[PDB]
Each structure stands twice: as C-alpha cells, then as structure tokens.
RNA sequence: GGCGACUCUCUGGUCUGUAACUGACGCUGAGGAGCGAAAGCGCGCCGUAAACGAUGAGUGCUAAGUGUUAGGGGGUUUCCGCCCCUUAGUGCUGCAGCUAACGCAUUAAGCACUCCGCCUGGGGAGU
RNA sequence: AAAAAAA
C-alpha cells in the first residue's frame, strides 16, 4: 500500500558512486560480489586506458544513452490492449540502464567480461551499440502507440 | 421573389433539417447536416445545425427573403444554434414556435 | 480538391494567421457560392482527419504543427489538474491531467502539446515547455520536521509543500504564516525549495488571516520614507498664492454626499435650475495633481499602487492618510482646491455647454447617503427642517438624476442591479454581521452626476485630439455570449441579435423582463459571466456597459491613479495650454504602460477585496453549522450545485450529500436531474439548505438539501 | 411574494385588459404558476379563465 | 364510478352569515327502485368490480401544534397589511384512551347511544 | 466564480 523503501547501497569505494556499486550488484552472480568488483575495476581501467577520460565521465554518459524516458505498459480495460506510454521513474531509469548494460555486455562477442563490459560502456557512451538501441527500440515502440496514454 | 417566410427546423437526435418556406408553406430552399456531408455523431451536433441553417438561409436570400418566422420540431441540440445561424445569415427572426407533435 | 486543400493550408501557414471558425474562414477567403462553401467544409474535414489542422473545442481551425500545441496561461486546480487558457481568448480551454503538468504552476505561460485522444468532453494536452514563470513568492503556513522545514501554501492550487532548507528558516516557528521566495521550482518528484523572506506571525493571531491575503496577491504595505516626508511637508491649509487663476466658488451652495464612514471625499456637487428649465450641474473634484506633482515621491508610489484597496477591516490607500483625509479631502466648511466640471443640462439630459477649470470651494455641508434618502424618499420632517436651505437643491438634484438616468437607459446602458454584501467587523477584525448593501436614491443620484462629468471630460479631450487616458469596456466575448444567449432561451427569454454584433440595449431588454422573477439573480449573473472586464487604455474605443463612445475616470484621483493622470493632462492641455508636439509625444509614450499597469492593479485590488469578503463570510458561518436557511440555486456543475442565501452568502451542495438519487448534470438546461426520482434541481429554483461544514482556511461552505 | 389582485383590491379580472394579463403569462405565452407570481389561489383561477377567454379571442397568443 | 379548452342554454348539491318563519317536521333503513369498470356480448344488454384510506351511516363528548381551500367577525388598517377568534372541508404531527402488535388519535381504529350490512378453522368451493 | 459603477 505504501512504497517500500529501496535498499540503501554503499558508494563504490574508488569512484564514490552508488551507481557504480549498483552495477556491481547487477553484475554479481551467485553472491560473488568479489568477481563483479574485480570485473568493473578491470573494465574501467580498460575504458581509461583507451579513451583517456575518467571512467566516470564515460559511464555516466553511457547510462544517459541507455536510460529510457518512456516505456510500454500493457492495459486491457474491456478490450483496449493499449501499450500505455509510461514515464520511467528516475530509479527505474537507472534500473533499466544497468540491467540492459549488463544484459547486453554478457551477450557480446569479446572473450573476457571486463572487456565485454568496457566495450558496451564505450559503445553506450558513443550513443551506439545494443543497449542504447534497446532504449530507442522501446521509444520507437512508445512513439508508435503514443496515441493512448 | 417573396420576402416573408417560415424556417422549419427539424432537430432530431440523429440530424438537423432546415426547410425555409413562404407563408403558404411552399418550399423555397432546404439543407441538412447530412446534405453538408456530416455523418454519425456530427449530424446531431449544434455546429452541424448551425451550418445547416446557413446553407438553407443562403439558398433563401437568393430568392430574396428578409424576415423569418421559425418553427422548431424535435428534442435535438440544434434549435438554439440553428436559429442564431438564421439571425447571423442576416434574416430577421420575428417569432419562434415549438411545434413538436 | 487537393489544390484547394493546399491553398487553405498555405493560407493557414502564414505568420499572421490566427485560429478561425468556418464562418471567419468563409469571410477571409471571399467564398460567396454555396458549392465553394461545401468544398471548404470537406477540405477542413479531410485536413482535420489527416491531423494537418486542429479544430479547437470553440470550433476554430488552427495549424497544430506550427504549434502541434497551443500557447497559453495555466489555470491550476487544487486536486492537481489544470486548464490551459489560450492567448487567443476565442479558443477553448485545454484540460491538462496532473501527470502531464511537467512542473507547471498556476499563472505560468506554457506551451501545451495536443493529445490526439481525449478521455472526456474537452480537448486534452501535455505541458512540453515553460516559457514564463508567474509565481516567485508563495505565502503559506510553516511546519517544522526534524531536519528540515516545509511551508503549506495558502494558494491550494499549489498542491505540493515548499521545502525550506534549515538555513532558509530565518526564525520561523511552527504555525507561523510566512512569505517564502522560490529558489527552485519542482523537478520530477522533487518539490520546490525556498527561503522564508518574511514572518507575518502565528496563524491564530487576530488580523494575520487578512495580512496573509495582502501578501498573497503582493499588495503594498507601508509607504516609503521619502513619500511620508513629502506628505508630512505638504501644508495643512491652502496658500494664498495657489488661489491665483482659480475661479472662486466659496460662496456657492456646494455639498459632499458619501458614506458615513468615508474620510476620502473626492467629489462635491451643486445643482442650480435655470430660467429656461435646464439644469446647471457643478462637479468639483479634489485637486490631487497639485499636491502630488509629476515624479515626486508620492507619485512614484501612487503609480506603483495603481489604486486604493478596500478590504473588509482596513483601507490600503493609494496616497498617504495625511493627504487623502486632510488637504485633498473636500472636508466640510474649509477652503479646498478643486478641478471642476460645470455643465448646462437641458430637458432631455443632453449637455449643451460645459467648462473644465481650476477652482477653490468651501463645502456648505457634509451629507451622508442615509440622510439624503430620508429627506427625499422617507419624507423626514426633522431632517428637512435641519437642512432647510439645501432641501430645494436636493429635490432639483433628484429630478436631474432621473433625467440623466432616463437618457442613459434609452441610449442602451446595461443596469446590472445585483445584491452585494457588506461585511461588518469589530475593532479586532472578527465578523459581527453580513448585511445587504442597498443602492438607494442618494447613491444613484451621485452615480449619475459622476457619470455625466466623466462622459463630458472624455468627450472634450477626444475632439481635442491629444494623448489621453480612457476607461474602455470592449464588446463581450462572442463565444461566451453565444452560450449566454442559449441559456436564456431555456427560460423562454428570446433576444433579438447575434453574438458578434449585439447592441447593449438588447441585453437590457432581458434584464427588464426577468425583474422580480426567481431566475433574475442567475440570468443576471450568467450574462455577467459573458461580459468582458473594463480596462484603461489611451485610445477611445467606447464603453459597452454604459453604451457610450466617450468615457474616462476623472471623479476619484485620491483613490485611482488613472484619475490623478486625467487631472495632470487637464492641467497640461487646458489650463497651461501645452499642446506642443514634444508634450504630446511624451504622454503618447507613457500612457500605454500606465494603462496596462493601473488596469492590472485594479484587478489585483478586486481579487483581494473579494478574497477577504469570502474569508469573512466563511468566518460568519462557523457558528451556523446545523442551521436551516432558505436560498436559491446560483450555479450547477457536474460535482454539485451552489446556493446563495439572502445575505448573499454562497455555499456548495456536493452531489455526495444528494443521497436520494444518482444525479446526472445536463449542461444545456443547467440542471441536476435524478435518474430514478425524476427530481430536477435547476439554476434559479428556491430551496431550503442546512449548513453541514465550514472551513475558514479553505473558504468553503458545504450544504445539504432539506427540501425544495 | 404578494398577490397583484389582493394588493390593488381588484375583485374582477377582465379578459379584455390584455396589458394586465400579459404580466402573468410567459414570453412563450404559457401561464405562469402561482408560486412564481405570488397570486392567490382564488385569483389564479379567475386569471386562468380570463387568459383562456382572451386566447380564444386571439387577444393573447396560445404559443409565441 | 368519477369530473380539467373556452363560451352559451338547463339543472343538482355544498359552505358561510343573520335569525324572519316553521316547531321535532329527525335518524337508520332489509326488501325495492335508481345509479354504477376493462366490463361480456349484441347503443341495448351485462350489472359485477381493491366498485377497499382493506375502515356503514347519524349524533354527542374527549390535550395540543402546524398547513391548505371557501368563508365570517374584530384589530389597527387608507386598503393591502399582518394579528386574533370562529365555521366548513382537506393534510401532516401528537396526547389521553384504545390495540395482539403495527398503529389510530376531534377526518378515532377513543369514550357513548340508535339503526343497517356482515363474520364464525383451512381446503373441498364460489364448486 | 466572473459586470458596471461607487467607496
């Protein structure tokens, strides 16, 4: 009945970003947060070595491009079947940002995850790749059925 | 060339008709929401009645009318708009009369 | 068909295009044949289907794409939704759902995108951009949480509580009414933040209720120091040098007639009957432009104010109390400077000869409106005997008034005779009684005299062809009046005329027919709600609601800045003779900005005055919860019907208290109809109501129906 | 809410006095109810007859 | 049972007021006669009807409060006005009393008296 | 809610 408070994650110790921590917890498998803490700090050294920019400048830029603005929600009042355009709450933006970032990074062709996650962030930051596309995809779809809401 | 006339408005829930006559009930002109190409819910609306009256009225001014008695029929939403469309077309409205059966 | 559609779209794509009806489009394209008219209609339908044009709910066609939008002002509601009031007032309102406001607040000029699908009767829209921010200050009640404040806004149209950071508190305790300046606006889910600019006091302290109103509109407080220095330096008696070049009238029979409690006497009058049967009327107004010169301290302040304001308990004056109740005031039996308008008036109320000049008067007696009624109407022998030398003039004034009233009404002026409240308070500001304010014979006499003097001054300066300020009242809104005309055909009142070319007299024909009917108060009130407000301007465009071509306000420069300018332009053009091109260009630059300002300062006075009245009515009804009163349905809405009492107090009957049936609103009839019972509550019915609840802070009176 | 006829002491309403009767009909020319016009029941009937005899003689309209 | 346009012709009943007269000339009323729905059927005939406020008729007595229709008297009132008493009718509340209870309550279903119709377990059977 | 006009 009353919106449950989301769990207050700690800031990532080296970038002081609760966003970066949330990425670690998204990447973590079978409660192996160590593996994911390593992978990211390996991925961000890869980003900083290639770009020269701070990984935080790139990662925040990457999230901007992945983060959705409007989403499709199924509404079936009587008939309807209306894909109601819904504005993504700022918490659900980051959610879907990090979910897609990780989900598509794992699917990439590169051998190691630290490289796969680095390359998906670098592609996301350049407003390209698959995770940015996925945001576009649902917006193209939300624009397509925009006459409901 | 007749000056005085009656503007017989039928406003149903489907449609607004407007016939304009002479005093002996011979038909000078007419129009209707349907004659103007409105269809469905639009034919009921007071806007369609307004436009119906103007088209009927502008047909009548060619035959050279000036004064209109009005007779309204039916429960529809047109009569108030359609009457002020007759005043706005130019023709003066002496008296209106609800002749709903 | 397609070439015609392109030609219409190209015409509508011109920069000067405004949204037009089919009839306006017909006129603008010079369509004269019935077949070309059919072609336009089919084209408008086809383009509207394609979404290349949009029909507004006021039946006007505009290109969305140049918008896909409409520019307009937000009118917010307290439940969280809003309406867009377009800039083009001929367009209809656009409903804005609470989620689609996108940080817009009440009064913000915005752009709104038009939604293709509407969920109801009205056209829906989303706020895409905010062009101008209206609200920069917010009054409210401060509240203290652990680590931060908030302020609950008194404007309930601001639905969200204003966050106060701990360093912005500035001393504000729990329950203190506070002014708050906005530092930030709302963004997403974050509320607006601020800083306490001022503490008023506690919300339970006497007079803070009104003071909160004064701050809510942004009404002027105390006078600046340089104004109070100028006022304190102004002499309390006339200097002999100022009597030069003024017509002496001190020996003539002149009187002020005002309210018993009025200290700001603007006007003094005289009426002499001439040998031919015509009347000589002298109107002698307080010469405020002498003591408040151009670009003095008091002038800068009196421009900033725009008008005096007449709240329940107090007066916020335009000029200092030392001036307004001292030297400008036409006080009894003391020498006073005036600017007079003396008029010879024949047996049909036409002004044949007039003169506007500087004078000194000495008023014979200060009357009241109650004393003057007792002499004329009630035929009171004690008061006649007391005022025996003035009694013949008071009867000569009465006959002149009638003659001027008979002229006015024959020219087609709309007499809008409604019952207004007057609230009666004690010295603390607590409410004693709400009585009817009656317009007697003595007020309507003074009314008519002021009117003719205001008419005679305007006319003189229009023919002079110099820059001047006029009080104009435009033609009413053609859509609003179209809806007014419909409403009166339901009661059987059949008007002669159309909404785009009504003569004022036609509206008076209605108001004479309904007189002493139950329907009166509401048809009266509904006509009103089709009228435009009157404003000042530099151009002569006429006054619709007096049915004249020439009008200005001249007869109250103590309490209206536009009147005070009329006194300076009269001194400039007539007395001094300064009709040079450089003088004219100076005023021709300045009057558009004064006219716009002073207009907006009047509407800010009215809104505020009313808001104190409605507060003190509500304060009146707090001890009347449970009591049964007879009344009359003043308004009917989708959510209920409003009821007016016999002291003008208004209250709502919410549909949720109509427990005997499921009520449906009929928009055409103005009625609440029961589905089962077949009971029909209409605008204009007499009903008995009981008082259920009274909320002083919100200014709500809730009623329930006992019987019809 | 006073009766015209009780007030002015009028004991006989006359179908020929049209300018009186017209005070009691609507603009359409329907008779106005007694609760609107303040009229006494006694007079309302008389009035009702008059208007009807008027209307027969085309002094008033049946329907304006 | 019913009876709603207006006018005209003919005709019935009711109420108020004053008492000029009459001087118990009254009341109820089986039968009978007349009136009397869709009626049911050939206007005639049918002759019954929740033709049930489910409450015979007539008379007298027995707290109040309030509304309305047609009146009467007084009060001041110009008249109107409102105020008050009183009559007849029609309503809503409400005593006392009555009721099994619901209710009724000066329009009694209260308290009395006269006369009439009618009832006496359900069904069988309105056969 | 909503007009003049007054104050």
Swiss-Prot record, chain A:
Q: Which GO terms describe its cellular component?
A: cytosolic small ribosomal subunit; ribosome
> What is this protein's name?
Small ribosomal subunit protein uS7
Organism for this UniProt entry = Bacillus subtilis (strain 168)
- How the protein assembles, per its UniProt entry? Part of the 30S ribosomal subunit. Contacts proteins S9 and S11. Interacts with VmlR.
Family of this protein: Belongs to the universal ribosomal protein uS7 family.
Name the CDD domains on file: uS7_Bacteria
Here the disulfide bonds are none
What is the documented function of this protein?
Answer: One of the primary rRNA binding proteins, it binds directly to 16S rRNA where it nucleates assembly of the head domain of the 30S subunit. Is located at the subunit interface close to the decoding center, probably blocks exit of the E-site tRNA.
The keyword Chaperone belongs to this UniProt entry's keyword annotation: no
Q: Has UniProt tagged this entry with the keyword Iron?
A: no
GO molecular function annotations of the record: mRNA binding; rRNA binding; structural constituent of ribosome; tRNA binding
Give the lineage. Answer: Bacteria, Bacillati, Bacillota, Bacilli, Bacillales
Please give a single GO biological process term from the UniProt record: translation
Q: Which gene encodes it?
A: rpsG
SUPFAM superfamilies hit by this protein: Ribosomal protein S7
Q: Which Pfam families match?
A: Ribosomal_S7 (PF00177)
Record keywords, A-Z: Ribonucleoprotein, Ribosomal protein, RNA-binding, rRNA-binding, tRNA-binding
From Swiss-Prot, chain B:
The record's Gene Ontology cellular component field reads: cytosolic small ribosomal subunit
Report the record's Gene Ontology biological process terms.
Answer: translation
Top-level taxon: Bacteria
Listed A to Z, the keywords are: Ribonucleoprotein, Ribosomal protein, RNA-binding, rRNA-binding
Which molecular function terms from Gene Ontology are attached? rRNA binding; structural constituent of ribosome
Functionally, this protein is described as follows: Located on the platform of the 30S subunit, it bridges several disparate RNA helices of the 16S rRNA. Forms part of the Shine-Dalgarno cleft in the 70S ribosome.
What does the subunit comment say?
Part of the 30S ribosomal subunit. Interacts with proteins S7 and S18. Binds to IF-3. Interacts with VmlR. Interacts with BrxC.
Q: Which family does it belong to?
A: Belongs to the universal ribosomal protein uS11 family.
Q: What is this protein called?
A: Small ribosomal subunit protein uS11
What would be the name of the gene that encodes this protein? rpsK
Swiss-Prot record, chain C:
Transmembrane helix recorded as keyword: no
InterPro entries named among the record's database cross-references: CSD (IPR011129), CSD2 (IPR040476), NA-bd_OB-fold (IPR012340), RNase_B_OB_dom (IPR013223), RNase_II/R (IPR001900), RNase_II/R_CS (IPR022966), RNase_II/RNase_R (IPR004476), RNase_R (IPR011805)
PROSITE patterns given in the database record: RIBONUCLEASE_II, S1
Domain RNB spans what residues? Answer: 246-575
Q: What happens when the gene is disrupted?
A: No visible phenotype. Increased half-life of type I toxin-antitoxin system RNAs of BsrG/SR4.
Q: A single GO molecular function, which one? A: exoribonuclease II activity
Q: Name one GO biological process term.
A: mRNA catabolic process
A Pfam cross-reference name: S1
Q: Which GO terms describe its cellular component?
A: cytosol
Name what induces it: Constitutively expressed, part of a 5 gene operon with multiple promoters. Not ethanol-stress induced.
Q: Domain named S1 motif: which ranges?
A: 626-706
Q: Where in or outside the cell?
A: Cytoplasm
**Which SMART domains does the UniProt record give?**
CSP, RNB, S1
Q: Which reaction does it catalyse?
A: Exonucleolytic cleavage in the 3'- to 5'-direction to yield nucleoside 5'-phosphates
Q: Which E.C. number(s) belong to this protein?
A: 3.1.13.1
The record's keywords, sorted A to Z, are: Cytoplasm, Exonuclease, Hydrolase, Nuclease, RNA-binding
> What is the documented function of this protein?
3'-5' exoribonuclease that releases 5'-nucleoside monophosphates and is involved in maturation of structured RNAs. Involved in degradation of type I toxin-antitoxin system bsrG/SR4 RNAs.
Q: Could you say which protein family the record assigns here?
A: Belongs to the RNR ribonuclease family. RNase R subfamily.
PANTHER family attached to this UniProt entry = DIS3-LIKE EXONUCLEASE 2 (PTHR23355:SF9), RIBONUCLEASE (PTHR23355)
The name of this protein is: Ribonuclease R
Give the species this sequence originates from: Bacillus subtilis (strain 168)
**Higher taxonomy:** Bacteria, Bacillati, Bacillota, Bacilli, Bacillales
UniProtKB/Swiss-Prot annotation, chain D:
Q: Please indicate which superkingdom the organism of origin belongs to.
A: Bacteria
Question: Per the record, what is one GO cellular component?
Answer: cytosolic small ribosomal subunit
What is its induction?
Strongly expressed during exponential growth, decreases 2-4-fold in stationary phase, part of the rpsF-ssbA-rpsR operon. The operon is induced by DNA damage by mitomycin C.
Keyword check for Ribosomal protein, yes or no: yes
Q: Which GO terms describe its biological process?
A: translation
**Which controlled-vocabulary keywords does the entry list?**
Ribonucleoprotein, Ribosomal protein, RNA-binding, rRNA-binding
Gene Ontology molecular function, alphabetical: small ribosomal subunit rRNA binding; structural constituent of ribosome
Say if the entry is tagged with keyword Transferase. no
What the protein does comes down to: Binds as a heterodimer with protein bS6 to the central domain of the 16S rRNA, where it helps stabilize the platform of the 30S subunit.
Family under the similarity heading: Belongs to the bacterial ribosomal protein bS18 family.
Q: What does the annotation say about its assembly with partners? A: Part of the 30S ribosomal subunit. Forms a tight heterodimer with protein bS6.
This protein is called: Small ribosomal subunit protein bS18
- Its gene name is rpsR
Q: Which residues of the full protein are shown?
A: 14 to 77 of 79
